[PDB]
């Protein structure tokens, strides 16, 4: 996260760290949506152009974390993956359209002050909150800049949703309805963006109707980090909720 700040303890209890077993390293962010299901970006698990195709046994999920590199004894919980489900129409060949994946844990994780699931939006909450200008929150242990370097603890930044035409005119990549972009415009002064290592993490919004946090997006892609005139792109969670429901219902 660039231009963000240290998260408070228990501020994002649904935050999940996708951890590579060997070598032990941070791969991506993710989110807890139930005691046995974790949501992340498909590109975090599958991306043929870079010879990336992880299997269940190559990864681990660390939940309830704050510190990036330390083993948080008596606080974080480490879970093994039972099965990975990537959207069947995830477009890794072109623009990362439908960049979403689900991971089922081998065993249910125990909720605590530091571990708690986030809500997935309904059509009405999505329609009401997904508006240009409305701000969401992005969290992660990704790099602090495109080029300090890495954060000691979880970072957080609030960013405004951007108008679709502006999103489209900011890049040469083909934008689809399954994506939305966020970030400040050059003339807005304020800055902030996700960066390397934050992918797969959540873009959440707190509903002013019921005071619950909803995950509206998944950190998907960007060209550089916090560059003027550029914006981060996020997977539109509600647009792909039918797929999420289908997977969970069947498995």
């Amino acid at each position: 996260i660039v231009e963000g700040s240290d998260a408070e303890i228990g501020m994002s209890p649904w935050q999940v760290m996708l951890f590579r077993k060997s070598p032990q390293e941070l791969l991506c962010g993710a989110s807890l949506i139930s005691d046995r299901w974790v949501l992340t970006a498909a590109h975090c698990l599958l991306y043929p152009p870079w010879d990336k195709n992880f299997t269940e046994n190559d990864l681990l999920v660390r939940i309830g974390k704050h510190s990036r590199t330390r083993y948080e004894r008596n606080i974080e919980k480490i879970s093994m993956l039972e099965k990975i489900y990537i959207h069947p129409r995830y477009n890794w060949r072109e623009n990362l359209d439908r960049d979403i994946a689900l991971m089922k844990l081998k065993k249910p994780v125990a909720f605590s002050d530091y571990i708690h699931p986030v809500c997935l939006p309904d059509r009405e909450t999505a329609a009401s909150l997904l508006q240009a200008g409305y701000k969401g929150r992005v969290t992660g242990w990704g790099n602090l800049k495109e080029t300090k370097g890495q954060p000691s603890v979880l970072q957080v930044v609030n960013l405004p949703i951007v108008e679709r035409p502006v999103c489209k005119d900011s890049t040469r990549i083909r934008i689809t309805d399954n994506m939305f972009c966020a970030g400040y415009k050059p003339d807005e002064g304020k800055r902030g963006d996700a960066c390397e290592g934050d992918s797969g993490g959540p873009f959440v919004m707190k509903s002013p109707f019921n005071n619950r946090w909803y995950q509206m997006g998944i950190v998907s892609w960007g060209e550089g980090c916090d560059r003027d005139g550029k914006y981060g792109f996020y997977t539109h969670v509600f647009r792909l909720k039918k797929w999420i429901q289908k997977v969970i219902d069947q498995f």
């Binding site: 700040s5 209890p13 699931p117 409305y134 707190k206 509903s207 005071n211 946090w213």
Partner: peptide, 27 residues
Amino acid sequence: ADCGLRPLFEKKSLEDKTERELLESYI
């Protein structure tokens, strides 16, 4: 169910340092 309600915040009626910024943007 109880999703989206944080034990250390909403559950105890405590607000985090920047959630107000989000609320103020929901005009």
